[PDB]
Design an enzyme around this catalytic site. Structure first.
Site: not given
Ligand SMILES: *[C@@H]1O[C@H](CO[C@@H]2O[C@@H](C)[C@@H](O)[C@@H](O)[C@@H]2O)[C@@H](O[C@@H]2O[C@H](CO)[C@@H](O[C@@H]3O[C@H](CO)[C@@H](O)[C@H](O)[C@@H]3O)[C@H](O)[C@H]2NC(C)=O)[C@H](O)[C@H]1NC(C)=O
Ligand SMILES: *[C@@H]1O[C@H](CO[C@@H]2O[C@@H](C)[C@@H](O)[C@@H](O)[C@@H]2O)[C@@H](O[C@@H]2O[C@H](CO)[C@@H](O[C@@H]3O[C@H](CO)[C@@H](O)[C@H](O)[C@@H]3O)[C@H](O)[C@H]2NC(C)=O)[C@H](O)[C@H]1NC(C)=O
Ligand SMILES: *[C@@H]1O[C@H](CO)[C@@H](O[C@@H]2O[C@H](CO)[C@@H](O[C@@H]3O[C@H](CO)[C@@H](O)[C@H](O)[C@H]3NC(C)=O)[C@H](O)[C@H]2NC(C)=O)[C@H](O)[C@H]1NC(C)=O
Ligand SMILES: *[C@@H]1O[C@H](CO)[C@@H](O[C@@H]2O[C@H](CO)[C@@H](O[C@@H]3O[C@H](CO)[C@@H](O)[C@H](O)[C@H]3NC(C)=O)[C@H](O)[C@H]2NC(C)=O)[C@H](O)[C@H]1NC(C)=O
Ligand SMILES: *[C@@H]1O[C@H](CO)[C@@H](O[C@@H]2O[C@H](CO)[C@@H](O)[C@H](O)[C@H]2NC(C)=O)[C@H](O)[C@H]1NC(C)=O
Ligand SMILES: *[C@@H]1O[C@H](CO)[C@@H](O[C@@H]2O[C@H](CO)[C@@H](O)[C@H](O)[C@H]2NC(C)=O)[C@H](O)[C@H]1NC(C)=O
Ligand SMILES: *[C@@H]1O[C@H](CO)[C@@H](O[C@@H]2O[C@H](CO)[C@@H](O)[C@H](O)[C@H]2NC(C)=O)[C@H](O)[C@H]1NC(C)=O
Ligand SMILES: *[C@@H]1O[C@H](CO)[C@@H](O[C@@H]2O[C@H](CO)[C@@H](O)[C@H](O)[C@H]2NC(C)=O)[C@H](O)[C@H]1NC(C)=O
Ligand SMILES: O=C(CCN(Cc1ccc2c(c1)OCO2)Cc1ccc2c(c1)OCO2)NO
Ligand SMILES: O=C(CCN(Cc1ccc2c(c1)OCO2)Cc1ccc2c(c1)OCO2)NO
Ligand SMILES: *[C@@H]1O[C@H](CO)[C@@H](O)[C@H](O)[C@H]1NC(C)=O
Ligand SMILES: *[C@@H]1O[C@H](CO)[C@@H](O)[C@H](O)[C@H]1NC(C)=O
Ligand SMILES: [Ca+2]
Ligand SMILES: [Ca+2]
Ligand SMILES: [Ca+2]
Ligand SMILES: [Ca+2]
Ligand SMILES: [Zn+2]
Ligand SMILES: [Zn+2]
Lengths: 535, 535
Positions: A90-91, A94, A100, A149
């Site tokens: 996930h990072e 980014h 998101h 999320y």
């Protein structure tokens, strides 16, 4: 949710620095996440050597990244509790350029954000960006996205969710922590023009008539049959008889002819990019106890001619006649082919044969241990809370014995499975270092798809440490020698340690989605490996 | 079979010249082949404007191309008898960097070449190239490839093949002339890094719970159900009950409630790259004759907000309750959403409703005329040799009437379907030019797959001409006015011209393959359009 401006795009390989404020566990978890990118995409990473833009991975408060290439070099924070594959991915997404999923321009069609419920300074994780800033890459909103999320994200009150799907069924789906979704990978490909991956070398399920370019020689005495799944007791592993006229396997019958008759099935030529490969496949052996499935390589003899034979592994039949999983380590550095030799033993004592489906070849290590638990849905009803199953003992490359404990109904988390890892006593223990420390444990519950890009396997990671101690063993290190810290079991003649891992590893409802229980059976992989050299 | 040297690669769009020694038919067929590349790949083409490397298409002897970019400009020959989509696509694949599939380095594992059968000067088409010249692109050998020769290719003797498969089943399969295979598209994408394509904008089979990002409003009265196919006597179009628990469609029931109650199903937002689009879908109307299925657009109001309604088309139920195909022309030049309104009429006279499956949206024209022949396997048994079926009369954009003739068992070519084109009389004929001088006819048998990259639709092209004449009409032009050259039909009150077409359009064995007969029915597309502007 990808950033539109093309100057924010990286050039591969991305140069990186692992900071010494990361622990060993986080460094190991990051390198494991890089292997997942190579396996499922054309994204690649290199160590830093003075490039202009680069990523430095550090331990700061929380777990965060900037979005896109910041041309002066940039931080990714991996704090305490974030050294897990899905959070690293996930990072890195980014940094690659993704916001998101709830930050999409169209998100108000799919989800509700409860702004009154968000904790102070976290609300920007819930902002929506305009169509000039962000692209959809011509893809729908994905509830299964790794960039989405979970309902209880940055909430003031533990009973009240911050985010909810407008259709309530998806509240059980949003915020998965398994892997990249199919739409996450399709977006990643469209942004960076990937088509191949660095590490998926072959796969075959035998559904097309050309059987993935596999061939049959004449040096053998017989042939493998491409078999249709249209008989009562004969169904293929890919579809398990779900789909009429549509699931195929290879078969080698052993109920007739001479003993020692054989057939060879042989791959198309492959060009390896690394020095090590894992050949995974599924098989049955319903024939004689003296039948033999043998895996071979045919490799370049250095002239450019693929004709040098090398035997790699043998498989033989027991009283279990259901589908089994196999892994074979191959070590090829020149063009080669993979081969299956089916061999008849005692045809006068056989009513069956050998079966093959769902072959996969990756430029990776094989899993160190593999455990199949059969009839797992029936076990899940027959086993009381806090009753347990234990794996057979496995040995690592260094010679340490280990195993896994499975509590199908966790007492500590209702409606969850609990996987814990233990060290086992073994034949080497006298020469090995104790306590076993700086060894990373990767446990994975396999999502049973033959194409690796489709797989969302659940994975958990920890590293063995001096901080792991129990009052049950007079507050000594859990990883000291099993004869002194463990308890005896007649099941393997082992001493098994106190077991460390996760209550709440996976939900039973999650375990009923995808291919975690494909043929009513659960397959767990384990790796146990020294990461001291990353310090 | 791809050329390994990356300096042989093109930069897109490829600049082209159509030379005036090409007839109109050939120029029009080349532009049609470029549309097929833009629909299935990221390959693109521009008119020449003084670039360094370019392709000049010419009519010379035979049909041929150089392999890869020749940096000074290069010829493609399109000779007499080669104005066909599949042949033009094969030559463009040579220019893009591909050899024949029988020229692979591993080809001897799959095919036999009979050199003593090859006609003099053609033998280089059968050469094999080494792994230093050519890549496999990590792909198996493809018998279904557009780059593979048929058995009777350049043969001295009409009874003896030049090429045969080592497994004899594939002798019926090699040398297909439909379209790109799935592996040929995978090779083209790997060579040029394509992920998107220029002309496929959306598609939806409804198989995921996410329903391709489709949403349901609350300004309507009710909702469309996502329906499971697990009900007897009702299934989806995608899988037709082949596959347990698998096939989904949208359903709107009309058998209860008030009349004029409605449900809206609404797409995700779409960014059109062209000014015209075609929405294709499949539907059933088993309810009242007063039920409506209505297609709508919601488009950007120029503020960036997609809130402006436009009605595009309406559909109503006759006595046919099987799956029907539908095409809707859209003309969107800003971001938009496509919408389905189901409407109840007379719920006291309905025992059913409205069904949707298999949506495809492309930045193309829609087909000018579409014919469905139902129960085609039973027609193919029950029709004698040389007996015929005739389509309803279509009208083109210019107002000419036309149709097609189908002879299910062709007398001229045993084991083939014969398909032919005719001009119908119609309400405009008095003010139209006669004979038709330069209108290209494209006829297509639809391979019924919702993803356009999975289709291998059969297509034939010709241009109406002064040279088309018959002894039945005193050597006058076949394309003269249908009341003076055609025969009267009670079936449509038309005069239908003498038909022109192809004995041997498709074999019965080819037709019983892929998705040409998906629900026991045949779908034929027809386009009839002026190409005089290319002269
Ligand atoms: C003939 O083959 C059987 C097994 O093969 C099965 O039966 C045939 C008639 C065919 O129908 C085959 O398609 C089918 O697969 C052999 O029987 C097996 O023998 C082994 C070795 O003795 C047994 O293993 C033992 O099991 C006991 C417990 O029962 C353990 O204590 C031992 O440690 C050991 O593991 C196995 O159980 C047995 N299986 C069956 C189904 O009876 C048989 O020996 C063989 N005969 C010859 C002449 O080769
Ligand atoms: C009620 O609806 C039926 C058709 O609907 C069907 O039956 C219902 C009871 C429900 O079960 C529905 O789910 C189901 O779909 C109408 O009957 C149809 O009427 C049309 C128009 O009159 C008929 O078409 C004509 O057919 C004749 C030949 O028979 C031709 O010559 C005409 O040119 C024209 O095409 C059609 O045959 C008929 N179909 C049936 C099944 O009887 C009915 O009219 C309607 N009644 C009301 C109150 O609206
Ligand atoms: C993935 O492939 C894309 C093409 O399918 C690449 O997108 C292209 O990037 C080119 C630059 O590398 C663009 O050319 C530039 O266009 C701008 C106007 O937009 C001009 O001012 C520049 O002069 C021109 N530069 C050059 C070198 O010609 C293409 O327009 C652009 N095409 C599209 C369709 O966007 C991506 O760069 C590539 N992505 C990655 C990260 O590999
Ligand atoms: C799809 O993307 C690929 C990268 O992921 C491209 O492959 C690259 O092609 C470059 C040439 O266009 C290569 O650069 C050349 O490398 C050779 C050595 O291999 C040097 O001698 C040349 O000087 C150098 N040329 C340039 C212009 O730098 C890259 O090495 C090569 N990279 C890889 C990983 O193969 C494909 O070309 C691209 N395909 C298309 C056409 O879109
Ligand atoms: C990562 O963040 C750190 C801060 O946590 C950055 O370090 C700062 O760098 C600036 C500019 O040189 C200095 O003015 C600050 O004093 C530094 N702070 C600290 C505490 O070191 C670091 O540059 C960032 N890394 C990258 C490459 O983006
Ligand atoms: C979190 O929200 C719950 C639900 O609103 C709160 O529980 C309520 O507490 C109040 C008293 O403060 C009671 O009167 C209600 O009956 C409770 N409702 C339920 C359903 O339990 C809870 O107090 C909140 N906690 C925090 C952290 O504010
Ligand atoms: C492509 O075709 C053109 C037109 O025929 C060629 O141009 C001439 O071709 C003739 C016959 O080969 C030669 O005698 C002339 O000398 C050619 N003139 C030139 C150089 O323009 C052309 O050579 C062909 N080849 C390519 C790839 O351009
Ligand atoms: C093409 O090959 C066929 C088959 O070999 C030839 O037919 C044969 O002709 C010879 C005389 O030349 C007869 O003796 C054989 O009996 C024929 N065999 C069959 C099966 O018909 C045919 O003549 C060849 N034609 C050409 C163009 O050479
Ligand atoms: O928003 C953030 C926070 C990081 N993280 C987001 C996230 C991670 C993976 C996902 C996902 C969402 O949805 C699909 O899979 C949540 C998180 C996890 C563990 C933590 C923690 C925060 O704090 C310390 O321990 N940064 O980007
Ligand atoms: O080899 C050649 C010749 C062109 N063509 C090859 C070919 C075309 C499409 C294919 C295919 C093979 O296999 C799959 O689909 C055959 C051909 C067709 C019509 C003709 C003709 C030759 O001569 C005049 O009329 N050039 O490249
Ligand atoms: C699973 O149950 C079947 C009976 O339904 C039984 O034959 C089989 O041995 C069981 N497998 C195991 C080992 O759980
Ligand atoms: C196809 O045959 C069925 C009976 O099996 C019949 O009900 C249906 O009307 C036929 N369709 C056509 C028009 O061919
Ligand atoms: Ca299979
Ligand atoms: Ca053989
Ligand atoms: Ca509604
Ligand atoms: Ca469907
Ligand atoms: Zn995040
Ligand atoms: Zn060719």
């Amino acid at each position: 949710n990808g950033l539109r401006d093309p100057n924010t795009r990286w050039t591969f390989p991305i140069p990186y620095i692992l900071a010494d404020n990361l622990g060993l566990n986080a460094k190991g978890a990051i390198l494991y996440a890089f292997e997942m990118f190579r396996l499922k995409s054309c994204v690649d990473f290199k160590p830093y050597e003075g490039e202009s833009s680069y990523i430095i991975f550090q331990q700061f408060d929380g777990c965060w990244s900037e979005v896109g290439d910041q041309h002066v070099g940039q931080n990714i924070s991996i704090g305490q509790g974030c050294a897990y594959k899905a959070i690293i991915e996930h990072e890195i997404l980014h940094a690659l350029g993704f916001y998101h999923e709830q930050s999409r321009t169209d998100r108000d069609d799919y989800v509700n954000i409860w702004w009154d419920q968000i904790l102070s300074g976290y609300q920007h994780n819930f902002d929506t960006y305009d169509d000039s800033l962000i692209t959809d890459l011509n893809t729908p909103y994905d509830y299964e996205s790794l960039m989405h999320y979970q309902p209880f994200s940055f909430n003031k009150n533990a009973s009240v969710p911050t985010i909810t799907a407008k259709i309530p069924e998806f509240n059980s789906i949003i915020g998965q922590r398994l892997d990249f979704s199919a739409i996450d990978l399709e977006r990643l490909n469209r942004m960076y023009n990937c088509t191949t991956t660095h590490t998926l070398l072959d796969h075959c399920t035998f559904e097309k008539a050309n059987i993935c370019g596999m061939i049959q020689g004449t040096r053998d005495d017989t042939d493998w049959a491409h078999q249709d799944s249209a008989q009562a007791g004969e169904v293929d592993h890919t579809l398990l008889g779900q789909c009429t006229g549509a699931g195929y396997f290879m078969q080698f019958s052993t109920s007739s002819g001479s003993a020692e008759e054989a057939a060879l099935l042989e791959s198309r030529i492959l060009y390896p990019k690394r020095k090590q490969q894992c050949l995974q496949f599924f098989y049955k052996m319903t024939g004689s106890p003296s039948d033999r499935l043998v895996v071979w390589v045919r490799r370049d003899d250095s002239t450019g001619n693929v004709r040098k034979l090398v035997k790699v592994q043998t498989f033989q039949g027991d009283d279990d006649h259901n589908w089994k999983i196999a892994h074979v380590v191959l070590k090829e550095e020149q063009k080669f082919r993979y081969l299956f030799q089916g061999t008849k033993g005692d045809p006068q004592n056989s009513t069956g044969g050998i079966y093959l489906d769902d072959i996969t070849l990756t430029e990776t290590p094989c899993p160190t241990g593999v455990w199949t638990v059969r009839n797992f849905s029936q076990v899940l009803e027959n086993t009381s809370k806090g009753d347990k199953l234990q794996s057979p003992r496995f040995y690592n490359s260094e010679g340490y014995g280990f195993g896994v404990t499975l509590y199908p109904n966790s007492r500590e988390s209702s409606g969850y499975l609990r996987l814990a890892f233990h060290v086992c006593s073994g034949e080497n223990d006298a020469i090995l270092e104790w306590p076993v420390e700086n060894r990373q444990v990767i446990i994975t519950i396999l999502d049973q798809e033959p194409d690796v890009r489709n797989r969302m396997s659940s994975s958990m990671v920890f590293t063995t440490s001096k901080s792991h101690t129990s009052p049950a063993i007079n507050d000594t290190v859990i990883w000291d020698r099993p004869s002194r810290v463990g308890t005896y079991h007649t099941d393997c003649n082992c001493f098994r340690s106190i077991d460390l891992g996760w209550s709440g590893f996976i939900s039973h409802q999650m375990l009923k989605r995808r291919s975690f229980l494909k043929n009513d059976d659960l397959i767990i992989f384990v790796d146990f490996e020294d990461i001291t050299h990353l310090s």
